[PDB]
Symmetry: D3
Subunit: 288 residues, 6 copies
């Protein structure tokens, strides 16, 4: 544009949902509170996420390219591009072309390869959607698959108990498809849950382990990856980012779980947003 960004700008390719804490209504306040301008490229408008029984849904596939055409005319420079849940191969094509046209030598490209969970694909989707997400992540610097997504992206049978050595192998194989940094979430431990990561730079493998509370809050993945993104953009090391994001989520769940509560509403993000202002007093990351 006219001048270099005074606040770094992050193109956020997620939906807008009216209720719940998912997608743009978590990405925007988190990354803005971490110092960054979030510029939404919305994929859809929903009354609420699809974990409620009903929802309104308006597909924005056709508007995406029109927004992008305008951003080109404005000559906006993005310091990062963060993609989340994409509805189709066509959206992957748009997003893929968007990254191609707007990337710069210093861009951070973060893709959450939203495909499935608990070993099954999300019901919307099939193996072609897996194939196209696999093509998209070749362009990414950082990806954040869950364990289900890891195996689908690798085209491997889902396995729920892998050794650390096997997980290291998996991380490395997925990193060979493009991404310098691969982060796997929701990896079981042996009460307890785990995040693993590999960085092609230095060939390092990291893990963070933390308590697991028996509650599912939709939007947890988008929250995680928003904190990873903002921590990395702030210049934090990979394992510090794992730690900040896992602790932040844990804090939010602790702030939420003690209430009689409808979990579909999400983590009570607003009660813990400003925790990110405090320095981490106890890290737990491990080099493996």
């Amino acid at each position: 544009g006219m001048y270099a960004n005074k606040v770094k700008k992050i193109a956020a390719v997620h939906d807008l949902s009216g209720m719940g804490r998912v997608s743009l209504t978590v990405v925007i306040p988190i990354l803005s509170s971490m110092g960054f301008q979030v510029c939404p490229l919305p994929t859809a408008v929903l009354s609420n996420h699809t974990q409620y029984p009903g929802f309104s849904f308006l597909d924005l596939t056709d508007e995406m390219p029109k927004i992008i055409a305008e951003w080109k005319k404005l000559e906006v420079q993005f310091d990062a591009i963060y993609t989340g849940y994409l509805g189709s191969p066509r959206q992957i094509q748009i997003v893929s072309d968007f990254i191609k046209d707007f990337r710069q030598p210093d861009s951070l490209i973060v893709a959450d390869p939203v495909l499935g969970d608990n070993g099954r694909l999300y019901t919307n989707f099939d193996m072609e959607m897996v194939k196209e997400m696999r093509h998209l992540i070749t362009k990414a610097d950082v990806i954040t698959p869950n364990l289900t997504e890891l195996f689908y992206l690798l085209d491997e049978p889902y396995k729920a108990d892998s050794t650390d050595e096997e997980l290291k192998e998996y991380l490395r194989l997925l990193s060979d498809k493009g991404p310098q940094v691969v982060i796997i979430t929701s990896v079981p431990v042996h009460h307890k849950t785990s995040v693993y990561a590999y960085n092609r730079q230095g060939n390092r493998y990291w893990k963070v382990t933390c308590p697991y509370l028996p509650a599912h809050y939709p939007g947890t993945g988008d929250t995680f990856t928003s904190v990873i993104t903002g921590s990395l953009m702030q210049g934090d090391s990979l394992p510090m980012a794992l730690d900040r994001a896992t602790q932040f989520i844990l804090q939010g769940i602790r702030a939420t779980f003690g209430y009689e509560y409808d979990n579909r509403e999400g983590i009570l993000l607003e009660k813990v947003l400003h925790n990110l202002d405090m320095p981490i007093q106890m890290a737990s990351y491990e080099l493996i």
Copy 2:
């Protein structure tokens, strides 16, 4: 819904714009950083605000009622409803019916009666749009007209120099149309700018005066009224809210004005969001 809100919920009826800091991309991070869940009811999707030469525009008039129908099914309770720029009498009808159906005895209804500036109506609009905004504000507890909007809502010739006594009269006449609290922004002083307010409760009139820097940043009104809203929701007195919001804007402009900068991008909100965490050390409000 199933339980009382643990984080107060605010229905935000504004557009989603990809670039600039306006509408939902300021309302969401501000009110979320102040402790409140923002539940967007988007009016339109834009690549960028209309102060740039071009913009994409997708009217969401037809989706609004579908989202609302779903919110009814979810039985969501809103602690506040905040409306901003509305595109048409039809949107006012939707919003008006929405307030009617979702209001509760403790709801705060805040309407920014976005109609014009510098004495002219925004070019989209005409006197019928003024007539319907006038019908809408009858349902509001707090409105935040600029000086242009004051005069149109009262159906009075624009006057750029009024006495304080005349402004008090104007405030009182507009409050008689419904709103307990009327806040007028961008009121010239005698280098310096002013906000005035009237509260039917106690029949009090307040003003805050602060420096004026020669720069227009689109989104300033939405920023102001987001801070007013969140301050009031936090339990602040009316004049404290005037002070917090005016100082917050002043801080943001000071953080922005010293750079070679394209003003259309907005105030550098992210550099000052956390100022709201600090207590005000110097108030300047006046009882008039």
Copy 3:
């Protein structure tokens, strides 16, 4: 009174002691630092707590009703009423009548049923005092007995090792006498100490376990229950309140134990009061 409380008001029925950190000289600064006005209804004036060899003592039993008669004339509304150590059945009668006359639909009534410790009644007291505290707690929403008090209130032989299942039973039986929330302090573990809680709402049982340092600081119970009270009044979940209060006490003891120190002076509260301003970075509560 004339208007709704802008700062919530808490009637504090405790003694005033000149030295030590007990009763009103801990309740007042804690709850005031948490955002609440403490309105003392003093039960007695003492030079110092009774764990020193001597003390002055002035019984205020006869002044209590006179203060209350004036509060009625002022039409003060209390958002909470917190009772601590009461000297006699007559004080219980006064306090009981006070709660009856001043309670409102939203009042929080917190009673610390101060009766004994280490399995014996405090030496002042007998089984009639136990019977009248049992009548008083029927009116309370939250009680905080120690393990000795639990058993006396239930009219059960003291047992120092109970299973978690037995403690759950005890919690439930005591809750049946009135209190929605029963919190048991100083419950041995298996080096380590424990707090347990039951909430009739949702039928939930919680526990927090933390290190035990070998030192008794008089006023620890009043400190605990002041933090529980203020955390609950702030809108925290029950288990968060258990966590904040147990960590706060642990912090204070850690700040005190490393000095050559006369323990009767209490925890060095002033060195840790502002810890309560920070968000909890590590919770430890457990659902049982």
Copy 4:
């Protein structure tokens, strides 16, 4: 006692009032929040201050010496002694003997010579009470008379407009009666109010001027002098103490004045207590 104080201890000779923010219910939370243990020597127990139409009142004159006798047995060392409103010459005698017996080479003795306001003595009192307060302040290091009290202590006709030069003279004459530091509050300016001070050490005269809001909140003097005391105990210079205390009061009044409010309840202290944690960003003191 057994060891040197790890938290400095301040004997506070003020009443305990159940409602309002005056005397011990402001002194205790303020000085405790500033890092200091407040050890109350209560002069009376009241349902509420005497600016309401009625109040209960229990004179503690006879208990004061009993408390002190116990404090002697405990060998408590006080780092400061702060006296406020005293009911009679007999209380002055007790307090005077208390200071004599408990003072140490480093003690700070602060006396607020509570006698009158708006040029008249408080109605309880007469010239003998003035004579005995004059004897008491000979033992003090810091006194905080209002302008009415200045003139009575000097045995001079009240004058409401004095020059700065005349006020300097007055300060110096009163300092000659004992006190190293004399602080005069509520000194009119020329909308605006003023505090003046003299320090015999360096022979310096200081003033702070700040806005005046038209509202009387009982307890303002006790609040002021509690902040002066704690600031001085923290090692602040005299003029910094004037600044912290005047700004703190101004902040509290600003937090209170915008509400429909019964002023007799006091400044909303709890909304601003933690302002004292922040460093002063703008001083206004003047050397005169």
Copy 5:
């Protein structure tokens, strides 16, 4: 070196003085507290600054090149180079060669052209030292002359009252000798003091005006320019940097001036270092 700096590194060319707060003992703690590693290249070792009657002095001219030769071998990359008081033309030669060898495309070079004050050269120095400082500043991006230094660097008769228009001219002429940013300190106003600045980028002129207290604290210039440097390195606009640095100094002087104090010891920096952690609540910069 082996990797890019994780904490930006600033070569600081100043003396080390044992007592006083000047040179490296202010530069190091300030810039370190602002987020930056200070790598000292000491010019001399002194017991104390030369405003005391005596001082030890050890010239390090001969060691400077040896340190630099080692830094070359380590391949250290400096993000900024900040020079202060230089003792001779020979030191200017060393420093000048150092900047030449270690500058990179993004280096910030800050030179305080320490030459004189109150219209006279420092007594050590003559016009040849002025000529060589003039050669040095051609290599600088930011310089911070006082008004005396401005005139000497321009080779112009000292004038103590100049118009703003004349000062703008002076700023522009000095900027033509090399420096993009010229900051003049200690510019009289009309009780009050002023800082002016010019930025060749955008051709902007700024000023900040603040109170003047009658006290000279040696080290004030080094403190100022350390804050300017760190604020600019943090990405602040020029006028924000003027504001942060002037307010920081004002805060320190306010924290110091109220004590009986030996001014030669400097501003009580440690009492205000952490003020820099707080966001500026009131700016005062002016575009001229």
Copy 6:
């Protein structure tokens, strides 16, 4: 000097190194950020510490007495004296005479008896240097030997596995040579590392255990002992000081270890300096 210190002054006898974070470039910013003026008495000037392959080195042995002679003339009073790495018996003589001449009844004398590591003496040194450090520590209140230094100071064969009981014995024997407080660092545990301490006052033994990351950062000892010093000067108990300093180091290492990094540059101190502003939320000290 003319007046008592308003900021406590600490004479720091360490070298000045241009690169790395060791000696004065860590001591100065740490203790200054903790509230204390650091007055350097430099022992040498180096381009960088001696763990790099080459370094410049300028011995300041001959300047030390000249600086001290000037400090005597200034009549500076030091509240603490902290010695680190000393190059020779001659420097020990200077430092020893300095402590003798400048000590006051309240001085804290802290000596880090820098002699060796991993069981060998630093290669510069021999048993005479051990003998003279042993003479120096007789004058110290607090010493911080590593395990290697413990054994040399006691003139005992190095043992890498000692029982806690044996370590207590060692602590006590070394304390008998003078120091009230002996702190041993880098004591192996049984992944994990340990600090032990003895205080002759109360005859107490303390230990803190924390994670061990496999990386050596030169300057870790100087960082530790700077935090111990400042924590003690702030009035913290011995075990709190052990905790603050060990956690601070752990935080810094965690902030550093996740990067590809040249360890010789030191812990990224600037990323964690302000952690010291936060209160410790989890202590781990143990009384043994």
